[PDB]
Design a protein around this ligand. Structure first.
Ligand SMILES: O=C(O)CNC(=O)c1nc(Cl)c2ccccc2c1O
Ligand SMILES: [Zn+2]
Length: 216
C-alpha cells in the first residue's frame, strides 16, 4: 500500500482514536530480512553497548545487564537498509502532518537500535517523554521472525492513560508501531528469553521542541 493511503485511511484515524497503532508487513520479507542482517551485523561486530546495568552486585563479574543499544544515522556503511526504513517512516509521517492531533512534526531523532539479549531482562514501566522534551510520537520497527511470546516473552505492554485494560504487542517481524510518547502511554517490555531486536525513532512536535529549548 502507498504510504499516503496507509497514513490517511488508517494511521491518522487510528492515532486520533487510540494513540496506539500497529502496521504488519511494513516493508516486506526481503527488506525486513536485509534490515535484520544489518542489525545482526552491528551486534556481531561489537557495535552495541554492553547493556543497561540491571543488577550491580557487590562483585562485578556477576553483574546483570539488559538491553544493548546503538545509534544509527542511516547513511553509515552497512546500515543503508536501516536508513531506508527511516526514510519509509519519515515519508509516512509527512503524509500525516496536520492530522496527527494538533501536532506539527518538524524533525526526529536518529534511530536507536535496541537488543534485549534474552537473559530474562526487560524494561521497567516508563513514559518515553514525561517532561515535555519535544518528542510527541514514538515509532518502533521489529525484526523478530517467528517470535512467540508464550515461549520467548518480550511482550510490549502499554497502559493507555485512562482505560483500565492494557495492550500487549508482540515484537513480530516486519511490524511497525506508533504511539504517543507522552504520559498517555506508560509502557514496559516484559522479560525476554530470546534475542529481541527493535529500531526506534522519535518524532518532534515543532512547538513543544521550540519551548523545550528554553526550559532545557
Ligand atoms: O522495544 C519495545 O518493544 C519497547 N521499548 C521501549 O519502550 C524502550 N523505551 C526506551 Cl525509552 C528505551 C530507552 C533505551 C533503550 C531501550 C528503550 C526501550 O526499549
Ligand atoms: Zn519506551
Amino acid at each position: 500500500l502507498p504510504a499516503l493511503k496507509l497514513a490517511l485511511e488508517y494511521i491518522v484515524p487510528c492515532m486520533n482514536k487510540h494513540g496506539i497503532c500497529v502496521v504488519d508487513d511494513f516493508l516486506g520479507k526481503e527488506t525486513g530480512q536485509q534490515i535484520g542482517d544489518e542489525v545482526r551485523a552491528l551486534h556481531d561486530t561489537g557495535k552495541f553497548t554492553d547493556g543497561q546495568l540491571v543488577s550491580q552486585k557487590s562483585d562485578s563479574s556477576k553483574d546483570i545487564r539488559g538491553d544493548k543499544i546503538t545509534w544509527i544515522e542511516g547513511k553509515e556503511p552497512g546500515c543503508e537498509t536501516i536508513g531506508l526504513l527511516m526514510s519509509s517512516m519519515d515519508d509516512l509521517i509527512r503524509h500525516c502532518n496536520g492530522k496527527l492531533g494538533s501536532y506539527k512534526i518538524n524533525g526526529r531523532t536518529k534511530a536507536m537500535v535496541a537488543c534485549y539479549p534474552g537473559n530474562g531482562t526487560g524494561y521497567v514501566r516508563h513514559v518515553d517523554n514525561p517532561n515535555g522534551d519535544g518528542r510527541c510520537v514514538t515509532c518502533i520497527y521489529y525484526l523478530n521472525k517467528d517470535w512467540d511470546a508464550k515461549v520467548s516473552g518480550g511482550i510490549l505492554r502499554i497502559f493507555p492513560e485512562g482505560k483500565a485494560q492494557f495492550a500487549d504487542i508482540e515484537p513480530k517481524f516486519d511490524r511497525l508501531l506508533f504511539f504517543w510518547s507522552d504520559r498517555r502511554n506508560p509502557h514496559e517490555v516484559q522479560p525476554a528469553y530470546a534475542t529481541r531486536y527493535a529500531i526506534t525513532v522519535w518524532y518532534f512536535d515543532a512547538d513543544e521542541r521550540a519551548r523545550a529549548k528554553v526550559k532545557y
